[PDB]
Paper text:
Human RNA exoribonuclease 2 (Rexo2) is an evolutionarily conserved 3′-to-5′ DEDDh-family exonuclease located primarily in mitochondria. Rexo2 degrades small RNA oligonucleotides of <5 nucleotides (nanoRNA) in a way similar to Escherichia coli Oligoribonuclease (ORN), suggesting that it plays a role in RNA turnover in mitochondria. Rexo2 forms a homodimer and interacts mainly with the last two 3′-end nucleobases of substrates by hydrophobic and π−π stacking interactions via Leu53, Trp96, and Tyr164, signifying its preference in binding and degrading short oligonucleotides without sequence specificity. Rexo2 contains four strictly conserved DEDD residues (D47, E49, D147, D199) for binding two metal ions, as well as a general base (H194) in the active site for hydrolysis of the phosphodiester bonds in nucleic acid substrates.
The electron density for DNA oligonucleotides in Rexo2–DNA1 was broken, likely because wild-type Rexo2 was used here for cocrystallization with the partially degraded DNA. In the Rexo2–DNA1 complex, we used wild-type Rexo2 for cocrystallization with DNA in the absence of Mg2+. However, again, we still observed two metal ions (with a low occupancy of 0.81 for MgA and 0.73 for MgB) bound in the active site, likely representing endogenous Mg2+ from the E. coli host strain. In the Rexo2–RNA and Rexo2–DNA1 complexes, only the last two 3′-end nucleotides were observed, i.e., U–U in Rexo2–RNA and T–T in Rexo2–DNA1, with the remainder of the substrates being disordered. Similarly, in Rexo2–DNA1 and Rexo2–DNA2 complex structures, DNA substrates were bound only in the active site of protomer B but not observed in protomer A. Moreover, the 3′-end OH group (O3′) forms a hydrogen bond with the Met50 backbone (NH atom) and Glu49 (Oδ) in all three complexes, providing the structural basis for the preference of Rexo2 for cleaving oligonucleoties with a 3′-OH end.
Residue numbers in the entry:
A (entry chain A): 34 to 49, 61 to 84, 115 to 189, 194 to 217
B (entry chain B): 40 to 84, 95 to 188, 193 to 218
Write the structure that this text describes.
C-alpha cells in the first residue's frame, strides 16, 4: 500500500558533542544522509537542521529512532531536541536488544557478528543489524 | 547470571518531571524466557484518568498503603535474591520508558541491573517490517498482565521469525 514503505523507514542517529543522522528504508538500505554536526553551532540551530531533514524524509510521528546506544541517545534528545523527537515515533529500534538476543540464542553466530565518529558508529550499527537479519532471523 | 529482569510499570503520565509510579510488577526468566520467579506486584500511593479509572487502578491507588520507598525495598530485595549484581538486563515492551522512570525514582534497584535492555518493542518493529504475515498473528492496563503478555510476545517472535536450529 502507498506510503507504507515510507512509514516503515528508520531514523538512525548517533551522539558522541558530535551528532549524525541517516535514513534507511525498512530493509536497511541507506536512503539519505542528514546533518553531521558539532554542538556545544547552538543546540537550537542543530535541532532545526535535523528536524528539517527528517521532515523531508519521514511522515510525522511514524518512524522510529534506530541505533545501538539508542535509548540513551533518545533520553538525551527528548530533553535537548524535543521538537526533533516529536517528529518521530516513540518506539525505538535498539540494535543492542537484537545483539543481546543473538548472544543468548545464537552464540555461534554472535562470535562472527560485527562489533569513533558518529557517522561511523551509525554505519557499524546498520551493518550489525544486517548481520543479525542475515544470520539469526528466519530465511 | 544470564537471567532477565522483566518489569512493567503504570504511571500517572509520561512526564518525567511531574508524574509518579503507581503500579509495578517484576518477573525473572532464564535466557530462554522460562519464568523462574514471580516478584512483587504492587500498587503505589484525560486518557490516563479514563484508562486507569477503568481497570480499577486509580481506585486501588487511592486505597493503597505502599509507598515508593517500600515498593523499591521489596523489588530490590527480590532482585538481590534472584540475580547477581550488575549483570542482568531489564526486559519488557515499554522498557526504555520504564527505565527512565526507574532511574529517577528507583535508583538502587536499577543500580543492581546491567545497563543493557531487552526491548520487546524493537523486535515487534522489526517483525512488523520483515515478517508482516507472522506479525499479524502475533500477541487490561495492569503491570502484571502486561509483563506476562510481553514475555509471550517475545516468545512468539522467537518461535516464528528467528531461524530454527
Ligand atoms: Mg508496555
Ligand atoms: Mg502497561
Amino acid at each position: 500500500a502507498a506510503g507504507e514503505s515510507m512509514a516503515q523507514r528508520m531514523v538512525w542517529v548517533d551522539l558522541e558533542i558530535e551528532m549524525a543522522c541517516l535514513i534507511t528504508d525498512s530493509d536497511l538500505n541507506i536512503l539519505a544522509e542528514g546533518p553531521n554536526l558539532i554542538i556545544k553551532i547552538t543546540l537550537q540551530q542543530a535541532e532545526y537542521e535535523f528536524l528539517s531533514f527528517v521532515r523531508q524524509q519521514t511522515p510525522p510521528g511514524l518512524c522510529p529512532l534506530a541505533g545501538n546506544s539508542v535509548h540513551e541517545d533518545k533520553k538525551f534528545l527528548d530533553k535537548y531536541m524535543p521538537q526533533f523527537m516529536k517528529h518521530l515515533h516513540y518506539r525505538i529500534i535498539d540494535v543492542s536488544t537484537v545483539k543481546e538476543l543473538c548472544r543468548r540464542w545464537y552464540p555461534e553466530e554472535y562470535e562472527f557478528a560485527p562489533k569513533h565518529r558518529a557517522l561511523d558508529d551509525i554505519s557499524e550499527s546498520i551493518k550489525e543489524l544486517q548481520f543479525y537479519r542475515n544470520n539469526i532471523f528466519k530465511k
